[PDB]
Amino acid sequence: ARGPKKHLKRLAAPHHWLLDKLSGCYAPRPSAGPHKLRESLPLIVFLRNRLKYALNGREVKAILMQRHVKVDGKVRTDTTYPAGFMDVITLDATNENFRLVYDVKGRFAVHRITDEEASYKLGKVKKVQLGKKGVPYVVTHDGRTIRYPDPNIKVNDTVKIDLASGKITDFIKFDAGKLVYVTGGRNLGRIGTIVHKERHDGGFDLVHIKDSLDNTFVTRLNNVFVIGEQGKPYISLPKGKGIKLSIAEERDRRRAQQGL
Amino acid sequence: PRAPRTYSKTYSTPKRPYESSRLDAELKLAGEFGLKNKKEIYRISFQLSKIRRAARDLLTRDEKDPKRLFEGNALIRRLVRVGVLSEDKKKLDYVLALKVEDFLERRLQTQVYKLGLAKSVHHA
Amino acid sequence: GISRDSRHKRSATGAKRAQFRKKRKFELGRQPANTKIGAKRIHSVRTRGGNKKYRALRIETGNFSWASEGISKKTRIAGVVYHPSNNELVRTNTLTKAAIVQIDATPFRQWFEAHYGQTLGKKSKNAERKWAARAASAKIESSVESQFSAGRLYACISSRPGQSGRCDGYILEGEELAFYLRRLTAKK
Amino acid sequence: STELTVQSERAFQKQPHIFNNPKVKTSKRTKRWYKNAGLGFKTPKTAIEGSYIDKKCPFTGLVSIRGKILTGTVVSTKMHRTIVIRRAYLHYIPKYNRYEKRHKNVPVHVSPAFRVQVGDIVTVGQCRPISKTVRFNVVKVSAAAGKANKQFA
RNA sequence: CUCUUAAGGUAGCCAAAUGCCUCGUCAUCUAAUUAGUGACGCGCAUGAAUGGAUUAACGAGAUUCCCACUGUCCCUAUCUA
RNA sequence: UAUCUGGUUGAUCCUGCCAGUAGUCAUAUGCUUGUCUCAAAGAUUAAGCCAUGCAUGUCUAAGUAUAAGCAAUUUAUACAGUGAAACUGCGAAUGGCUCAUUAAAUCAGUUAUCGUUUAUUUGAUAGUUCCUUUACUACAUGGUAUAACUGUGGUAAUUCUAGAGCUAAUACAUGCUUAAAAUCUCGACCCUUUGGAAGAGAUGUAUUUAUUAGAUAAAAAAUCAAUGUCUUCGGACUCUUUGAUGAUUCAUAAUAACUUUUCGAAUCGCAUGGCCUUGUGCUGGCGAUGGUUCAUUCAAAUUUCUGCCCUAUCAACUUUCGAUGGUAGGAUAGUGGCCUACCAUGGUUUCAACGGGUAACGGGGAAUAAGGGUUCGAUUCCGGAGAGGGAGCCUGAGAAACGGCUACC
RNA sequence: GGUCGGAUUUCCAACGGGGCCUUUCCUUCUGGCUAACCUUGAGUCCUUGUGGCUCUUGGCGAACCAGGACUUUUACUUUGAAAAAAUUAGAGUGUUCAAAGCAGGCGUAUUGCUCGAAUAUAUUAGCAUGGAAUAAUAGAAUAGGAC
RNA sequence: GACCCACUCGGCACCUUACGAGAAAUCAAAGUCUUUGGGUUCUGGGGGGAGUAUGGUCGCAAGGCUGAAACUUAAAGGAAUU
RNA sequence: CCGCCCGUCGCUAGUACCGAUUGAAUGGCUUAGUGAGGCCUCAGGAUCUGCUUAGAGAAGGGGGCAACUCCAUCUCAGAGCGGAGAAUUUGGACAAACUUGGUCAUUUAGAGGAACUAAAAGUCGUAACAAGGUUUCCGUAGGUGAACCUGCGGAAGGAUCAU
RNA sequence: CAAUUUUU
């Protein structure tokens, strides 16, 4: 009613941020975002809680005035600036480069990538269109439209970006044996790479998804996303390798992590 | 305007109050190792209750069920990390057979007693 | 003040639907404008979200369409003769959607006969080859040519007079003028 | 639902902002526009060869079909150009561990090109709101009865 | 149980047109009430076809009140045949 | 974690209550009270009333600075460091609080928006600007019309307010200014008719109207008019041009008009360079604000699909003030009897509608616990309604706001 | 049980799963794939020859796609998708246990190292898929029937 | 044609007996019921107040149908032995 | 059976139920009316303005006898034509609040009337528990001071399962 | 024929 909601408390953002319960307060509310829902995360949640660089709320805002944060070469001194998916939060001095991927335990990641290969994102398309006065364009995760693309690719694939602007390079379709990747939901983002599609013309879309567990499951289309050619992948996957390894031998693996 | 922190009660009084030998059976259990009240044998029996309530639900469920193969095997090791019973009764069905005075036996009152040094549970 | 949603307006079965959430702002219907003729006294209104729109009052000259040529020259008006829904609107000579109006016959004749030179109805060589090549192409229909004779053209405000405020529409052509001469021949 | 110079009553209604060239002797001497419904919904030829206008029609008017689709039977052709539908269904009560038969009726706007009477197990679709009450519209009738096309007495 | 002659107000009803005492009392109407209406009752002296009680429609019958309306009155003036 | 005991009798068996028993994230109360962490609190009845004080303000390298405020010291010798007020922009529409209204209403899940808008967040973004003709004249930069301040005022009064004196712009209004090409209309016409054409001008987007295309199950010909290319010169030759959906009158392009002509940078910061013709010559960095349009995002608004407490000493509710539908409109951010004129008599129901009650906010849950459940949930989280009682309205992107206004009680 | 709370060369019995074939389950027209080589003409490393190969000629179109055309509708039920978290159950965890919480813990403590922050449960409504018993179910009667 | 005998159908009942059932008296149904589910309509939650008050409906009336609450208090009660 | 118990009446008490008051109040629909204020609009055009053009005191002096003739400034002017336009005010649509009737539901006051129920044997009587001394109990009707009695068709919870 | 009361 009556206007937007410039606050939200904790317990209202989901588990994948891993905040505290007994802070007894308001959550970090994300600002208005380029990309997606509050199932994304703002940058301060990535820094002071996952990467653990600070304690105070005055403290994390004081880092950004020194100008070390960077996505895509863009300045973005907003404190609670939201962070999309696979949108590499590169740094200044301290020189790290973090790609936003999903590990095997629900929430996102703390994963470094190298200096080179960090100058490109990876982009889901959602809407290809000819529009005003014959100017073709695509859209992205953030909806960063790109003038004069590769013509007639389609909606629903992935797009390589050149980071001077869009300047798209390579189309990656969907066929009987490629890479696909879940993004969101109860069984978000391990790998299933494909097994066989379907359509369900008219209502919704489903895709059969075959893990390295070598059984299958099915997640709907808005989590479905393609990475690339099979066994290539463009992003070094984090150190869970995308299985959903089962709980009966999750326990047998973690005391074989400690050696006892 | 804040988030709570929970609380819980960790005992339950027995239903029928007055049986002559039953109160004196827990006077044998009072008189064994020097308790101070009647509440702290209610609560391990309460811990006997909802562990045996927890023990009943896997036994009625399926064999070669991984929920039974996880929380039956992790249950019996936590049952023996405190060391109530030894390796001789590690086959997941003696958790039903467990008796009051055995949860009592690994308390720090009667462990200082049994390991010399105190002569008496009241001195312990 | 007057509302538009259905928290009044008795339900399907017929119960007296009891109320809460008294009359809001995001359904408000502004009071009408019931526009007339009389040459550009128009006021605008502030609207929702950051936008602007036109209450036209007292309009008499605006653009039309034939539509067989795509002409659209701002001609004057003379008045309505048969409103398609009700009949009180012609005793005061207003204009709405689909108002059957009559105009002047004059400003399109400067377009028509300068472009063809026939001449209805009874100089350089760059355009001399125009009517000497559109043989029986400019000719429309007999009853329309009879309708030029009284100096009036039956027009139709297809645009909305009070939302966008334009003086806009087209003129009757083809079977539709036979519909507004279904009864309008024998109505008196 | 309308004959006798089908564009009949006091006003004049036509398929909006489409004109035929008012002099050239082209094929049907009209440009009758229709809408492909899709999803296997065989748009019948009664809208293609028809003469009605009916802006509310899903096959020649300004409405698509974009929601869910439902079923049910006809109980009242007593209206003008609309029919109401009684969806019958069972319902589980958790307490007594037993079912119960409930229903509720729903009005549905119908194109005049179809043909619908009692019985007539019908398929309707969700639409944009079109009246005070009618929130749906029909897509196909395609239903027999207790030996229609066959019985005589 | 008993006496004057025989049997000793039952169903009901009331300060009623029937109640002297008496403008009886209580409640209600109004600003005030010897008037009205509803209950009281051991009723000078109510009462069962010398008919007792309750009655829908009606009354040139008698009453009390309310609402509209006006020289009835405040407070009178004038005009006509 | 499935547990029972006493009393109808002279005694016995039994249907069946009362009492006894245990917990309450369930209240009050009596008595008693040492340790330690954790923590609900004027919900129940009167959403009845209020003293008092506080809960919404906002500044940078980078808006508006003559403060007759400062602080200085060299600078900016018009300023540049600050710095009140006050203008401008922005917030105030979140947050918190209560449950009186509220029984298909809100609400839980569950789609839909082809039926819409959205300051802010992002990313793309405007070679035409007036064509009064070339002396309208600033495009090397035009204007008002003013606050704070100063002077004397009024009333006992309130975040009450006057006439006079100048000045600000990112407030406010004008307003040009950096190309080329192609098309269409006209005509200087001569020179011819199957002809050409200097040059008179327009062309950005918005806005509204009207049209056209946006096609594309399978391959060849005869036949009548004009006839592009080329030639043996019977006459012959053409890759002859399509985005998404399930689909559109969709995005779109094109044509002729269109607007009390909407918009298309006359705004500030740090830096000082290159240039060769050292001339107020020509180039050029990194930003900050603000602006149209598209797609997002932040959200709002409608909307389908199911579920509801007690009540038949509630048996037929609904329309001539729309009840149900059609027809056409008026408004609307857009849909719709939302409203209006005409027309049709329709909607729900013995699966309980309608009417009444409800110590009824709706859900995620909580308490007791064999299973099967009964009863609460005003209250921590989500959504709704309200700010003494019903109305109405401005500002603003967002309100029918209430620590905003108007009127009545 | 091979030889390390534990592993096979074929093989034993049971458990359920699928292709079939029995008179026998068979959505179809147009193409691009294909999909078989069951083809076939020849050569056809290594044998005495598609067991390892090709140019591959009717050389089986629909398992990978989208058009023409329909399709007895329901319950029921498996699985998955699915309900914001806390709360419920529930693995780790010296908050000292417990109420809790989500941490911590391991080196080397000379200026680092890593595990975690699980997991289920959540029913009625809707969606998709596997199943065809049980209970409804309608298409052949003046044949206006199927092919 | 009535009867005698044997049989069977459907009746209305009777006698024995219990395996069975229950509180007992008793029962071929009151059986096949904690070894609890063949369908299907209705009725009762202590006794009193009471088939009473108000409300409705059917009657010409007597009255009939539907039908509480306030208050009251431990039995009223069913069967059986002496 | 020196058992049990039934009813009127008496006293002590309590409990709801009705009831004249054209009852009273609160709340919800309602017909008929008055309609505060605010919006959209028809007019109002006060009071602030600028533009242009025809004459001039003063003198501006493109030059000079005056003149001619430059825009004219200190500004009246006589005309147009616009720009913002405040009070005021008609019409239209929202409607707070009020008046008057009727219904619906809840609560509350009432002279007094009959009931019910408890409560030390109070009198008058025995109605029912044995064939309760006239067997008992139903439905209905009549009488009575109270139990009760009687007539009518039943039934045995009977005092006969029996010709 | 008629037989009543005899009292937590």
Curated annotation (Swiss-Prot), chain A:
Assembly: Component of the small ribosomal subunit (SSU). Mature yeast ribosomes consist of a small (40S) and a large (60S) subunit. The 40S small subunit contains 1 molecule of ribosomal RNA (18S rRNA) and 33 different proteins (encoded by 57 genes). The large 60S subunit contains 3 rRNA molecules (25S, 5.8S and 5S rRNA) and 46 different proteins (encoded by 81 genes).
Function: Component of the ribosome, a large ribonucleoprotein complex responsible for the synthesis of proteins in the cell. The small ribosomal subunit (SSU) binds messenger RNAs (mRNAs) and translates the encoded message by selecting cognate aminoacyl-transfer RNA (tRNA) molecules. The large subunit (LSU) contains the ribosomal catalytic site termed the peptidyl transferase center (PTC), which catalyzes the formation of peptide bonds, thereby polymerizing the amino acids delivered by tRNAs into a polypeptide chain.
A biological-process GO annotation: cytoplasmic translation
Keyword entries, A-Z: Cytoplasm, Isopeptide bond, Phosphoprotein, Ribonucleoprotein, Ribosomal protein, RNA-binding, rRNA-binding, Ubl conjugation
UniProt cross-references to PROSITE patterns, sorted A to Z: RIBOSOMAL_S4E, S4
Residues the record lists as Phosphoserine modifications: 31, 246
Name assigned to this protein: Small ribosomal subunit protein eS4A
Domain S4 RNA-binding: 41-104
Modified residues (Phosphothreonine): 114
From Swiss-Prot, chain B:
UniProt key word Ribosomal protein: yes
Cellular component terms (Gene Ontology): 90S preribosome; cytoplasm; cytosol; cytosolic small ribosomal subunit; nucleolus; nucleoplasm; small-subunit processome
Keywords noted in UniProt: Cytoplasm, Isopeptide bond, Nucleus, Phosphoprotein, Ribonucleoprotein, Ribosomal protein, Ribosome biogenesis, RNA-binding, rRNA processing, rRNA-binding, Ubl conjugation
GO BP field: maturation of SSU-rRNA from tricistronic rRNA transcript (SSU-rRNA, 5.8S rRNA, LSU-rRNA); ribosomal small subunit biogenesis; translation
Coiled-coil boundaries: none
Compartment list: Cytoplasm; Nucleus, Nucleolus
Presence of keyword Cell inner membrane: no
Top-level taxon: Eukaryota
GO terms, molecular function: rRNA binding; structural constituent of ribosome
Family: Belongs to the universal ribosomal protein uS4 family.
Subunit structure: Component of the small ribosomal subunit (SSU). Mature yeast ribosomes consist of a small (40S) and a large (60S) subunit. The 40S small subunit contains 1 molecule of ribosomal RNA (18S rRNA) and 33 different proteins (encoded by 57 genes). The large 60S subunit contains 3 rRNA molecules (25S, 5.8S and 5S rRNA) and 46 different proteins (encoded by 81 genes). Interacts with snoRNA U3. uS11 interacts with MPP10. Component of the ribosomal small subunit (SSU) processome composed of at least 40 protein subunits and snoRNA U3.
Note: Present with 106000 molecules/cell in log phase SD medium. There are 2 genes for uS4 in yeast.
UniProt name for this protein: Small ribosomal subunit protein uS4A
Name of encoding gene: RPS9A
From Swiss-Prot, chain C:
Region spans: Disordered: 1-30
Note: Present with 15900 molecules/cell in log phase SD medium. There are 2 genes for eS8 in yeast.
Described function: Component of the ribosome, a large ribonucleoprotein complex responsible for the synthesis of proteins in the cell. The small ribosomal subunit (SSU) binds messenger RNAs (mRNAs) and translates the encoded message by selecting cognate aminoacyl-transfer RNA (tRNA) molecules. The large subunit (LSU) contains the ribosomal catalytic site termed the peptidyl transferase center (PTC), which catalyzes the formation of peptide bonds, thereby polymerizing the amino acids delivered by tRNAs into a polypeptide chain.
Name of protein: Small ribosomal subunit protein eS8A
Protein's gene: RPS8A
Residue numbers of Phosphothreonine PTMs: 61, 106
Record PROSITE patterns: RIBOSOMAL_S8E
GO cellular component: 90S preribosome; cytosol; cytosolic small ribosomal subunit
Sorted UniProt keywords: Cytoplasm, Phosphoprotein, Ribonucleoprotein, Ribosomal protein
Molecular function GO terms recorded: structural constituent of ribosome
Family: Belongs to the eukaryotic ribosomal protein eS8 family.
UniProt subunit comment: Component of the small ribosomal subunit (SSU). Mature yeast ribosomes consist of a small (40S) and a large (60S) subunit. The 40S small subunit contains 1 molecule of ribosomal RNA (18S rRNA) and 33 different proteins (encoded by 57 genes). The large 60S subunit contains 3 rRNA molecules (25S, 5.8S and 5S rRNA) and 46 different proteins (encoded by 81 genes).
Isomerase in keyword set: no
Curated annotation (Swiss-Prot), chain D:
Major localisation: cytoplasm
Subcellular location as annotated: Cytoplasm
Keyword Repeat applies: no
InterPro entries: NA-bd_OB-fold, Ribosomal_uS17, Ribosomal_uS17_arc/euk, Ribosomal_uS17_CS, Ribosomal_uS17_N
GO molecular function: rRNA binding; structural constituent of ribosome
Pfam families for this protein: Ribosomal_S17, Ribosomal_S17_N
Modified residues (N-acetylserine): 1
GO cellular component, one term: 90S preribosome
Cross-link (Glycyl lysine isopeptide (Lys-Gly) (interchain with G-Cter in ubiquitin)): 14, 45, 55-56, 78, 95, 104, 132, 140, 147
Post-translational modification: N-terminally acetylated by acetyltransferase NatA.
Alphabetical keyword list: Acetylation, Cytoplasm, Isopeptide bond, Ribonucleoprotein, Ribosomal protein, RNA-binding, rRNA-binding, Ubl conjugation
GO biological process, one term: maturation of SSU-rRNA from tricistronic rRNA transcript (SSU-rRNA, 5.8S rRNA, LSU-rRNA)
Assembly with partners or alone: Component of the small ribosomal subunit (SSU). Mature yeast ribosomes consist of a small (40S) and a large (60S) subunit. The 40S small subunit contains 1 molecule of ribosomal RNA (18S rRNA) and 33 different proteins (encoded by 57 genes). The large 60S subunit contains 3 rRNA molecules (25S, 5.8S and 5S rRNA) and 46 different proteins (encoded by 81 genes).
Misc. remarks from the entry: There are 2 genes for uS17 in yeast.
Family: Belongs to the universal ribosomal protein uS17 family.
Protein name: Small ribosomal subunit protein uS17A
Organism: Saccharomyces cerevisiae (strain ATCC 204508 / S288c)
Organism taxonomic ancestry: Eukaryota, Fungi, Dikarya, Ascomycota, Saccharomycotina
